Ligand binder design. Structure first.
Ligand SMILES: CC(C)C[C@H](CNC(=O)Cc1cc[nH]c1)Cc1ccc2c(c1C(=O)O)OCO2
Ligand SMILES: CC(C)C[C@H](CNC(=O)Cc1cc[nH]c1)Cc1ccc2c(c1C(=O)O)OCO2
Ligand SMILES: [Cl-]
Ligand SMILES: [Cl-]
Lengths: 148, 148
């Protein structure tokens, strides 16, 4: 559980926002990319796994699950690649709600930045800091407990 | 101490590698940029502060310390901007040694990736995972102890 992440791809302003969610805490990292390709997803995962102890990733779709480049990155970084099928259906709704929430925050900051990528990083900040603990606090506590 | 980071700019292959070091743990995040501008440094800091609880940043040089865009990002993210003057001179040698170490790792992986940015993220991964605890383990424990 401390090492489980879920990928999530959402769209805004004709661009793609790729999100990784730490399932147990709700903590996220995100980036704007021109389109979801295997190469972009693979690079995003390499970044994520260098920053947090990523053991398992539930991939967001079958193309990324199949991608040889995504598979290469998961091999390189020691990540177990799994499907993202919500066997528990409350999983879908949780991600859906998060995408709506993230888009809301993006709208609230959009005018403070010229570029979407900046607004997305502002949204990541607000999401991870929002309080009762924050997602940032929860992920650190979960991983620290696991290390001990 | 749990919230203190230091910026570090190093060069390779005609490109710029911007690094943030969590001083107490040795944990890093890094990116490749075409050149070190206020705008790039500001964006990097916004990303960092959304991901870790960044209280204080020792900026890497006077141009970034002065930059209105860097100041705007620090204001936005609640970061206290400080100079990076090594009043304690062992600070300079520590960063120097880390840049040499990072470049060594980059050379060891360079052939496994087409692009420098990829090699840098591989280097971040290896640096943060290297063991006795790793830098990734130390930063999590430090912040968790602080939260409690
Ligand atoms: C920290 C926030 C409050 C401001 C900065 C600077 N932006 C402005 O002042 C433009 C402006 C906004 C309203 N009127 C004029 C945002 C920023 C920082 C770094 C970047 C950016 C951006 C961006 O604008 O997307 O793009 C890539 O690197
Ligand atoms: C996970 C590692 C082991 C491989 C991947 C895929 N690269 C190759 O297979 C090319 C190759 C290298 C040697 N011979 C053929 C690296 C990678 C992933 C994602 C990216 C990249 C790169 C990159 O190559 O820089 O660039 C931006 O998005
Ligand atoms: Cl790690
Ligand atoms: Cl945080």
């Amino acid at each position: 559980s401390p090492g489980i992440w879920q990928l999530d791809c959402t769209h805004l302003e004709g661009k793609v926002i790729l999100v990784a969610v730490h399932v147990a805490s709700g903590y996220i990292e995100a980036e704007v990319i021109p389109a979801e390709t295997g190469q972009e997803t693979a690079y995003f995962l390499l970044k994520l796994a260098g920053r947090w102890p990523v053991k398992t990733v539930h991939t967001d779709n079958g193309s990324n699950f199949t991608s040889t480049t995504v598979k290469a990155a998961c091999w390189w970084a020691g990540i177990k690649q799994e499907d993202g099928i919500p066997y528990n259906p409350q999983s879908q709704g949780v991600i859906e709600s998060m995408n709506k929430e993230l888009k809301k925050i993006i709208g609230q900051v959009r005018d403070q930045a010229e570029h979407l990528k900046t607004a997305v990083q502002m949204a990541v900040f607000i999401h991870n800091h929002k309080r009762g603990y924050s997602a940032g606090e929860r992920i650190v506590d979960i991983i620290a407990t696991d290390i001990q």
